[PDB]
Design a protein around this ligand. Structure first.
Ligand code: ZN
Lengths: 519, 191, 286, 287
């Protein structure tokens, strides 16, 4: 549980020993460069690649360092390596071009993921048998988007058009966005596929197709180097009703995530200056995404100054997540900010302090924030910070999956169902991708209760643990049978219980058991 | 038609019952208020007319309203106390002009002065500077006198009257047994 | 005439509305509201109230603006919908007692019956009771000063009859009831010293200031009764009260015997189940 | 053909006006009018709420006087109340909070101007003083019987709307008759002014008056409560002398629902007043 005051020095002084050996190792430079993130520690290893004249060994370090562990350090190292070289000359050019490409991973993932798909008619037929026109309509298309993610299998949605556009509401927006979740990583078939739907008059009666086209386009071009943002500014400049602003703001902010450009900040501010809650919520999410690591001076004070001067709540949650995602790496900085903003009169901003300090203290590096996290989770009377408090506890304690049920097992069956629901999300996020049974043996008391909150959160928490697990290792027949009986028992259950039931069933069938999740 | 507010201030001192002038001219100027309020009613019935005195303890007799049916009853029981009060007499109406219902109605306040002024020239130039500053139409009507008619009130009006183009007019009535209605109805302010 | 009054929080929350519908104009002066209540019974009971446009002048304090037509219309419609409550007086939100209040209250003294006056604070920073009933009655002074309007303090209480307690308790969900016991008592026994310390300490400063640096006689006659009541306890030697300390200490001994004996009775089920349950669960566990 | 997720904002103004209006809520049918401001599509805020004079006819379109309504609304427009009406409220005592044909007819006639037409019915007559949870009513379109009934998004708040779960009105008359969720809002001025006002409502004037009353009544009146408390203590110990026989015979199962412990703990809590106020008398005697 280092405090980063000496770990960076010990690492930066211990990385000088392997370069003097007969051959350099990758586990130490990776396991150090994932934490220190110092520019002076990469300038030597980026220039020694030319001196060593070894092409095979650089592909791995380029693949993983350009893969993860940094976003803005990659945004700076791409021009650091772009400056080095020509403004083996013929080989270093194709090397430096092909190392920062990043599309080869999308090609191979699209390849094996395009030839490993396995679909069954029982699941989709069961969804069509249990589909409702009111609530679970979005659950069916989001489950179909989960199971058909990456495989670009639109033939399932090419069967008929009377099942998607039968109602003019947000269901078509969730269906088009779900289609954006289906196919991803397309520079021509994306815009061409969206334009081929109605290339007759260029005036759709339902703007949810355009909003879902911009949001889906942002889902497709997320973290890509071939962004169409330049065209997204000329397309976003057009005046439209709550679809170019919302969908265009979400897609533009997601595509421009990590760029920290002042242009999207200016147009985003003038887009939120209309006092609207929807475009201010989407503008808050987009601003939080694009401000990853920027830490602008006047932005925080301008948003917290804009918070209490309005009555809507969607603007307070949009700016809440906006100021929550911007806080990254400010362990030694956000102390007075979170400590000062923790005693605010607004419960929404009170949740914004916990969500803000959640990602700031990742790695279980601070055991002091849990004092006020659980102190406000138990002491406060409003259930908002009570159900929204433990998400920070899981976000800071996601390292050890065994230590979580020992302290949240009391919150499994709490006094009010709100702490039971938020605690169910805590068990869902803390043990995700693992195989710890300390929550699985406690899932049985969670799934039987007259309140639908703990039942929904119990089905989601069980759906986040049953993924990527074999039956011969642990007897999952209990939760498989009691979870499969929810779609046949939905007639005697609540309207939302079947929504979270089939929505939980869409997690296991996501990608046909090929793709999983990892924290 | 014309959208403006009408405010009249009548004197309640004992100087209005002298036998040399009209026989208790309070009823005569009451009929003057009647013919100007009924005249403005015939021109535009949406105009509101208020009633207030200039005594030491100023009391709002009638709120600004076009309904004169109860104003006719409020014109009685004048309570003839006090002699004169100018500062809070101006401030009691010119500052209360913001309490009117219609914001489009112009500001117009008249006053019946039946007693000699007790304020010095400094209060005349300060209050005149305030009235000229806020740009409120002020009509000065002086009934009865003891000293010379206009000695400092001339400079008071000349320094108070702004916007010389179709601005305010001064009403000076000479002594005489004839009625004052036809004399005060001569300027354009009446009708 | 009136010994005590009853003021419901609905009128003070109507003052919260007076501070809500301002509109950020920058005036926030002493908005005068027309207080309503039941003057029939000897005790005064405020149910609700309304407002009247009131504006003063910056320099001149004697300027006051009221309205008779709006008062007769609000009183006529309010009396038509509820004839059980009539006009009683008025109230201002200004923390300072200005001289113009005799002219403002004099109107409701002539037209209306004897009006009660209530001074509150614009900012909820005063720890004391914000409501003070000040009756408008003329009292004869001994020094020979002319008879003028005197504001005598009448005690007040903040209580709700049927529903406002339920509404306030539902909207708060943080305040606690009486709950006789340890916490509700020890909180009062801890913070009461500040509850008297801020008031008395806040008063003795302006008091001692106006003692030496004071003019415009403030009825110094009452100060003789002030220091007299302050000297009604001339540091008693506690010689006679020793037996009373023996009585209260004897009751303390009774509480000691009740605590030790009763807790000793409570220790039965615990100090028995801890053995019979652990030994049987252990001998029968495997 | 479009619908959103609306939510009615309820402050303490309309709540307290419905509490006093509920106290004056005679069995005769009453009338009321709500005001507010429309900022967007899916939110509504109520600020001004007043009462209406009762009539022998009751809740009807003929009882609503247009010159009286427009007159009072004009008198509110000349003052610092620039808010337009948002709906009308009433009370349904005895026969339940459901709406009859006349109420839905005058609601259909009164909803021609405002598309929202918020309707709230307070009934504190048979409602216990423990909860004051109120519910807002809405009107559905008659042409929506072919399509879905309520295509409202954000189905999370329906769990909070399921608190009024009466098995006769909700689904006993759910056809062509639905409801909407209700939330509250409180600023710092209501929190500190109302919180300190309620604490002061449960406190003293100078906060030092009624302390010595109990501190000195511990020797006069509380002694009787201590002697009677010991009489109940002995009245339980006379059976506690018989408890070790059964506890010494069976030791299996519990038959007496009485705990005999928390009551004595409460007696100790009432007895600790002497200990807690002894230091108070020490401070009054000391200084
Ligand atoms: Zn009835």
């Amino acid at each position: 549980m280092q405090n980063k005051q000496f770990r960076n020095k010990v690492l930066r002084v211990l990385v000088k020993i392997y370069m003097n050996l007969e051959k350099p190792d990758f586990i130490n430079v990776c396991q150090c460069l994932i934490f220190l993130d110092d520019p002076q520690a990469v300038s030597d290893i980026l220039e020694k690649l030319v001196k060593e004249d070894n092409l095979l060994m650089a592909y791995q370090i380029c693949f993983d360092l350009y893969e993860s562990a940094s976003q803005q350090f990659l945004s700076s190292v791409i021009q650091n390596l772009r400056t080095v070289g020509t403004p083996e000359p013929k080989d270093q050019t194709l090397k430096m071009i092909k190392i920062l490409s990043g599309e080869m991973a999308i090609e191979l993932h699209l390849q094996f993921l395009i030839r490993n798909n396995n679909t069954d008619l029982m699941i989709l037929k069961n969804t069509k048998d249990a589909v409702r026109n009111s609530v679970c309509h979005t659950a069916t298309v989001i489950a179909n988007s989960f199971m058909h993610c990456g495989t670009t299998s639109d033939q399932f949605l090419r069967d008929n058009l009377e099942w998607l556009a039968r109602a003019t509401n947000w269901a078509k927006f969730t269906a088009t966005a779900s289609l954006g979740v289906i196919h991803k990583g397309h520079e021509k078939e994306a815009l061409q596929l969206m334009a081929t739907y109605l290339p007759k008059d260029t005036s759709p009666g339902s703007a949810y197709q355009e909003g879902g086209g911009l949001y889906a386009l942002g889902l497709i071009h997320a973290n890509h180097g071939g962004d169409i943002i330049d065209y997204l500014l000329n397309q976003l400049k057009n005046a439209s009703n709550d679809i170019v602003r919302h969908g265009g703001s979400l897609g533009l902010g997601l595509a421009a995530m990590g760029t920290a450009r002042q242009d999207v900040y200016d147009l985003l501010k003038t887009n939120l200056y209309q006092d609207d809650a929807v475009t201010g919520e989407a503008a808050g999410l987009a601003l939080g995404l694009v401000m990853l690591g920027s830490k602008n001076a006047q932005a925080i004070e301008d948003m917290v100054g804009y918070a209490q001067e309005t009555q809507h709540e969607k603007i307070l949650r949009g700016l809440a997540v906006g100021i929550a995602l911007v806080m990254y790496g400010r362990m030694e900085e956000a102390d007075a900010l979170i400590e000062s903003l923790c005693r605010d009169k607004d419960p929404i901003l009170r949740r914004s302090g916990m969500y803000t300090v959640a990602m700031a203290y990742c790695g279980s590096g601070n055991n002091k924030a849990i004092r006020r996290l659980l102190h406000v989770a138990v002491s406060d009377v409003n259930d908002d910070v009570r159900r929204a408090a433990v998400e920070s506890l899981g976000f800071i304690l996601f390292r050890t999956p065994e230590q979580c049920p020992s302290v949240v097992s009391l919150l499994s069956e709490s006094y009010n169902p709100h702490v039971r629901y938020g605690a169910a999300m805590a068990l869902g996020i803390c043990c995700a991708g693992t195989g710890n049974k300390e929550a699985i043996n406690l899932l049985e008391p969670m799934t039987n209760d007259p309140v639908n909150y703990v039942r929904q959160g119990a089905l989601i928490a069980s759906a986040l643990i049953m993924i990527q697990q074999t039956e011969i290792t642990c007897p999952k027949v209990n939760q498989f049978r009691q979870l499969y009986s929810k779609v046949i028992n939905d007639k005697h259950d609540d309207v939302m219980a079947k929504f979270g039931a089939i929505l939980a069933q869409g997690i296991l069938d996501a990608g046909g058991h090929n793709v999983t999740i990892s924290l | 038609m014309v959208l403006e507010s009408t405010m009249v201030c009548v004197d309640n001192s004992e100087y209005m019952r002298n036998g040399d002038f009209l026989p208790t001219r309070l009823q005569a100027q009451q009929d003057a208020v009647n013919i100007v309020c009924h005249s403005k009613t015939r021109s535009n019935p949406e105009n509101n007319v208020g009633l207030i005195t200039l005594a030491n303890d100023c009391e709002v007799l009638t709120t600004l309203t076009p309904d004169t049916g109860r104003i006719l009853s409020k014109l009685h029981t004048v309570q003839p106390k006090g002699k004169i009060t100018f500062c809070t007499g101006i401030r009691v109406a010119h500052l209360a002009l913001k309490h009117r219902q219609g914001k489009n109605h112009k500001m117009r306040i008249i006053a019946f002065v039946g007693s000699p002024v007790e304020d010095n020239e400094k209060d005349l130039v300060k209050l005149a500077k305030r009235l000229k500053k806020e740009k409120v139409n002020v009509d000065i009507i002086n009934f009865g006198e003891e000293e010379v008619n206009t000695e400092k009130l001339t400079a008071f009006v000349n320094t108070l009257n702004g916007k010389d183009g179709t601005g305010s007019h001064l009403v000076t009535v000479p002594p005489g047994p004839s009625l004052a209605d036809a004399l005060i109805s001569s300027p354009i302010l009446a009708g | 005439a009136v010994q005590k009054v009853v003021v419901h929080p609905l009128v003070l929350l109507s003052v919260v509305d007076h501070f809500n519908r301002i509109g950020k104009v920058g005036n926030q002066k002493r908005v005068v509201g027309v207080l309503l209540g039941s003057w029939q019974k000897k005790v005064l009971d405020v149910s609700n109230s309304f407002a009247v446009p009131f504006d003063e002048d910056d320099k001149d304090d004697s300027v006051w603006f009221l309205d008779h037509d709006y008062l007769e219309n609000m009183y006529g419609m309010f009396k038509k919908v509820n004839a059980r409550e009539r006009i009683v007086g008025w109230y201002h939100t200004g923390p300072k007692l200005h001289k113009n209040d005799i002219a403002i209250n004099e109107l409701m003294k002539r037209y209306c019956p004897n009006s009660v006056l209530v001074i509150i604070d614009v900012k909820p920073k005063d720890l004391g009771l914000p409501t003070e009933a000040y009756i408008s009655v003329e009292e004869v002074h001994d020094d020979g000063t002319p008879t003028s309007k005197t504001f005598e303090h009448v005690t007040s209480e903040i209580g709700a009859e049927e529903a406002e307690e339920v509404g306030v308790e539902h909207l708060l969900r943080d305040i606690k009831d009486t709950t006789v016991g340890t916490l509700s008592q020890r909180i009062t026994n801890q913070v009461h010293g500040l509850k008297g310390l801020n008031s008395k300490l806040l008063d003795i400063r302006s008091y001692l200031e106006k003692v030496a640096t004071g003019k415009l006689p403030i009825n110094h006659q009452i100060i003789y009764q002030l220091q007299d009541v302050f000297n009604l306890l001339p540091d008693v030697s506690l010689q006679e009260f020793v037996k009373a300390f023996y009585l209260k200490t004897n009751d303390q001994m009774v509480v000691v015997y009740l605590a030790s004996l009763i807790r000793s009775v409570v220790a039965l089920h615990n100090l028995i189940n801890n053995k019979i349950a652990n030994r049987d669960a252990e001998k029968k566990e495997g | 053909a479009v619908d959103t997720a609306e939510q009615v904002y309820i402050s303490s103004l309309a709540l307290l006006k419905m509490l006093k209006h509920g106290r004056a809520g005679v069995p005769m049918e009453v009338m009321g009018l709500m005001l507010g401001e429309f900022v967007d599509d899916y939110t509504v805020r109520v600020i001004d709420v007043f009462a209406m004079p009762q009539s022998g006819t009751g809740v009807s379109v003929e009882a609503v006087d247009p010159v009286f309504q427009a007159k009072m609304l004009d008198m509110l427009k000349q003052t610092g109340r620039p808010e337009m009406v948002v709906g009308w409220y009433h009370s349904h005592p005895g026969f339940g909070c459901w709406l009859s044909g006349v109420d839905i007819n005058t609601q259909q006639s009164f909803e021609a101007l405002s598309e929202r037409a918020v309707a709230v019915v307070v009934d504190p007559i048979q409602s216990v003083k423990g909860k004051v949870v109120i519910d807002a009513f809405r009107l559905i379109n008659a042409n929506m019987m072919v399509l879905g009934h309520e295509p409202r998004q954000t189905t999370s708040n329906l769990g909070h709307l399921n608190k009024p779960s009466i098995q006769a009105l909700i689904h006993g008359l759910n056809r062509h008759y639905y409801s909407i969720t209700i939330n509250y809002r409180k600023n710092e001025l209501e929190q500190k002014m109302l919180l300190n006002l309620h604490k002061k409502s449960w406190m003293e004037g100078l906060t030092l008056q009624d302390y010595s009353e109990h501190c000195k009544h511990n020797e006069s009146v509380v002694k009787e409560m201590l002697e009677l408390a010991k009489n109940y203590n002995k009245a339980v110990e006379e059976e506690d002398k018989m408890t070790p026989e059964q506890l010494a015979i069976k030791n299996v199962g519990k038959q007496d629902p009485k705990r005999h412990l928390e009551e004595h703990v409460d007696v100790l809590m009432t007895s600790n007043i002497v200990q807690c106020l002894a230091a108070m008398l020490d401070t009054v005697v000391f200084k």
